[PDB]
Amino acid sequence: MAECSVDIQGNDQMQFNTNAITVDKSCKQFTVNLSHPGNLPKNVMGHNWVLSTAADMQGVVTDGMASGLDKDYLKPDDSRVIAHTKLIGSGEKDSVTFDVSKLKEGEQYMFFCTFSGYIDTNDGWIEGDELYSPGHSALMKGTLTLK
Amino acid sequence: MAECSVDIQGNDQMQFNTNAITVDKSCKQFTVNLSHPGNLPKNVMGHNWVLSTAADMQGVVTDGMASGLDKDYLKPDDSRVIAHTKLIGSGEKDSVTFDVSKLKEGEQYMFFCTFSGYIDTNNDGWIEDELYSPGHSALMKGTLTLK
Amino acid sequence: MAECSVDIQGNDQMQFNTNAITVDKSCKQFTVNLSHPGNLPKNVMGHNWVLSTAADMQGVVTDGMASGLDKDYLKPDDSRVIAHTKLIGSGEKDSVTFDVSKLKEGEQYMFFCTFSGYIDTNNDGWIEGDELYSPGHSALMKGTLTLK
Ligand SMILES: [Cu+2]
Ligand SMILES: [Cu+2]
Ligand SMILES: [Cu+2]
Ligand SMILES: [Tb+3]
Ligand SMILES: [Tb+3]
Ligand SMILES: [Tb+3]
Ligand SMILES: [Tb+3]
Ligand SMILES: [Tb+3]
Ligand SMILES: [Tb+3]
Ligand SMILES: [Tb+3]
Known part of the structure; x- marks a missing residue:
């Protein structure tokens, strides 16, 4: 029978395991x-x-960044977000279930994390070029296809 | 004058201070x-x-393990649990008070922590033997007597 | 046009950036x-x-210390506190806005953090003896505020 779930880990090195x-x-x-x-x-x-969708990713990550921590780095009521888990820290779990009817075969989708802290690349502070961060989506992203 | 309280610390090395x-x-x-x-x-x-009680410890730690993080690693309404604090992280405090009438002199009791997180022993970023943990009770346990 | 805001960072080394x-x-x-x-x-x-005010600082830090973590290290309804943010951890933000009419020119004010956790100076895993005394973050996280 068909597999209709996937288990994913996100770690402290900003990596998903798929x-x-x-x-x-x-x-x-x-x-x-x-x-x-x-x-x-x-x-x-x-x-x-x-x-x-792949097309919408850049838009949802940017508006998520702006929405900030108290909105789980997600624009409230963002139509471009097909499905999402809540934001979790280390030791936590969360699951989301969505209808496969929301997907079209042939369309390109992306999964990703929208969390965006600032990274102190230097120092103790956040300054200069560190104020530009793409967030976790730079490294925590991948493809999703309906086949 | 009789002392009817005790102050206990639990630290990041999985130790109580008694x-x-x-x-x-x-x-x-x-x-x-x-x-x-x-x-x-x-x-x-x-x-x-x-x-x-000493007899009940193994039962409460196992069912606590199974109950998981969202139930504070405790079976809800567990008759075997005489008293318990809530689960606390670093920088937090909690107190529990119980009636000493719930204790018998001559009986053997145990205090312990029921938390059971995963440890990434092979430092690879994931959890994959690491699924099996005895939990904090292995190291965070001790005797309680009425005298 | 006047600047009527400031951005402040508090870090893990117990420092404000002003x-x-x-x-x-x-x-x-x-x-x-x-x-x-x-x-x-x-x-x-x-x-x-x-x-x-500078005069009130020692009083608000002490009563904040006593009030503890569950009251954001602040005495509830403290009249000496002109304005305050909530308590934040790493990765969080908070803003407070207050009326400048609440300030007098000539008066000396202080800003500070009232948080007081314990420091394990002897790296033994516990908090004991002289470590039970901490002055709190205000010792290092403090500065002047003036109306000019
Ligand atoms: Cu992330
Ligand atoms: Cu524990
Ligand atoms: Cu502070
Ligand atoms: Tb399945
Ligand atoms: Tb920096
Ligand atoms: Tb007493
Ligand atoms: Tb029941
Ligand atoms: Tb591993
Ligand atoms: Tb401005
Ligand atoms: Tb110590």
């Missing part, structure tokens, strides 16, 4: 089970799993 | 004041203080 | 935007930004 999901067409719903190995708390190294 | 409590018979109630020195958050290195 | 605020008299309101670079959580290395 780069690609292929959802089976005969699944009515698909479920992502997100967990977070590591030691760092949610507010410093938090992860979510969020799904958009 | 191995033995002796409660004074003339105390009507006894209070444990739990604190948590260290840097690690509740979900990664959380501690509680929970009291059962 | 020691002195001068509020412009033509500002109707002044706003502090507090952020917290670092890795340590709120309960271990939390910061706030709180404003009193």
Whole structure:
């Protein structure tokens, strides 16, 4: 029988443990089970799993960045977000289930984390070029296809 | 004057700062004041203080393990648990007070922490033998007697 | 046009990134935007930004210490506190805005953090003896505020 779920880990090195999901067409719903190995708390190294079209990703990550920590780095009521987990810190889990009818075969989707802390590349402070951060999506992203 | 409280610390090296409590018979109630020195958050290195008979310990730690993080690693409404603090992270405090009438002199009791997080022993960023942990009770346990 | 806001960072080494605020008299309101670079959580290395007269500082820091973590290290309803942010951990932000009419020119004010966690100076895993005495973050996280 068809597999209609995937288990994903996001760690303290800003990595998911997969780069690609292929959802089976005969699944009515698909479920992502997100967990977070590591030691760092949610507010410093938090992860979510969020799904958009490839085209929409840049828009949802930017508006998520602007929305900030108290909105789970997600624009409230963002139509471009097909499905998302909540934001989790180390030691936590969360699952999201969504209808596969929300996907079209042939369309390109991306999954990613929208969390965006500033990184002190230097010092103790955040200054200069560190004020520009793409967030976790730079490294925590991958493809999702319906096949 | 009789002392009817004890102050206990649980730290990031999975240690309590006592191995033995002796409660004074003339105390009507006894209070444990739990604190948590260290840097690690509740979900990664959380501690509680929970009291059962020696006989019941193995049962409460196992069912606590199964209950998981969202139930403070405790079976809800567990009859075997005489008293317990909530689960706390570094920088937090909690106190529990219980009636000393719930204790019999001659009976053997144990105090312990029921938290059971995953440890990334092979430093690879993920959790994959690492699924099997005895939890904090292996190292964070001690005797309680009424004398 | 007057500047009527300041951005302040409090880090894991118990430092603010300014020691002195001068509020412009033509500002109707002044706003502090507090952020917290670092890795340590709120309960271990939390910061706030709180404003009193210089005279009142010692009183608000002491009563804040006593009030503890559950009251954001602040005495509830403390009349000596002119303005304050909430307590924040690493990765959090908070802003407070207050009326500059609450300030007098000539008066000396201090801003500071009232958080007081314990420091394990002897690296033994516990908090004992002289470590039970901490002055709190205000010892290092403090500065002047003047109306000019
Ligand atoms: Cu992330
Ligand atoms: Cu523990
Ligand atoms: Cu502080
Ligand atoms: Tb399955
Ligand atoms: Tb820097
Ligand atoms: Tb007493
Ligand atoms: Tb029941
Ligand atoms: Tb591993
Ligand atoms: Tb401005
Ligand atoms: Tb010590």
